[PDB]
Amino acid sequence: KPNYALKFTLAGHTKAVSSVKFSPNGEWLASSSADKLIKIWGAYDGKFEKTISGHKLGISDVAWSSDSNLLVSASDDKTLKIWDVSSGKCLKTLKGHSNYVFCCNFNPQSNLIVSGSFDESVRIWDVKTGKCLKTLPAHSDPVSAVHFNRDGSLIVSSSYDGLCRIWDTASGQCLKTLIDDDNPPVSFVKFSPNGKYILAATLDNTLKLWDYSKGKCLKTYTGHKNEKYCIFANFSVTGGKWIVSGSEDNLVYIWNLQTKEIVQKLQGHTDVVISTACHPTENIIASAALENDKTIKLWKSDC
């Protein structure tokens, strides 16, 4: 069992926090908010670093480049912006979607960015030029998540339309649609570190682990509350192997990857825990909450 325990609470955002992510080097934490803002924090001490301004409306997601130098964010302002982190410069503004941008991510090479929007589509952008390379007609409802795999060859996407689809990055061809038995709106999706599996959150208070090839649901993780918000989830693999995920009952849930039972429930937040993230190398988890709470928390573990 893990022993995660509160080490830091980070106040700053004046509106709901939407997403946190650890820089790839494990030095920084990045956060985005309904307050149109991004904030940087020291990954180990929670020491506030800087603030990054620019979006005209709130932000739903943010994501690090592979070298921890750039950031991309997805805003209700129908755009994405790319940022030099240490300079705080807005390098590019990606225009294209016809409604809110909801999720975003770099490919491992980080010459690419994938995004997802309420307009029901998925776009692939060029980092260097801000140009929309491809526009996949991905879903028939808003898009809740997008993620590259270990080598940038594949993108996974999810939607309120019930579906998780896998796409070939090069061609933009849909290689796979994942169908369960009931198909509740799909609110989050993410590859395993090795790309072999897929972890998917779904508004029936369920998380499922899928084998991407065979296209079959393997594990199921429940116990939490998730029926309204798109809550991030994670594979924790720095110590033991767990599944971490926010929850709408204000707690951070932890599951044993294999047996699929709750091995820990973190207490602290006072509103929906909307996002979680697991440090690159250390057993550190970052958590963040909605309008009524607005803080970010870091918990550490020995296991």
């Binding site: 309904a34 309204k228 918000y229």
Partner: peptide, 5 residues
């Protein structure tokens, strides 16, 4: 946004 509903 992701925080409204």
């Amino acid at each position: 946004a992701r925080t409204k509903q």
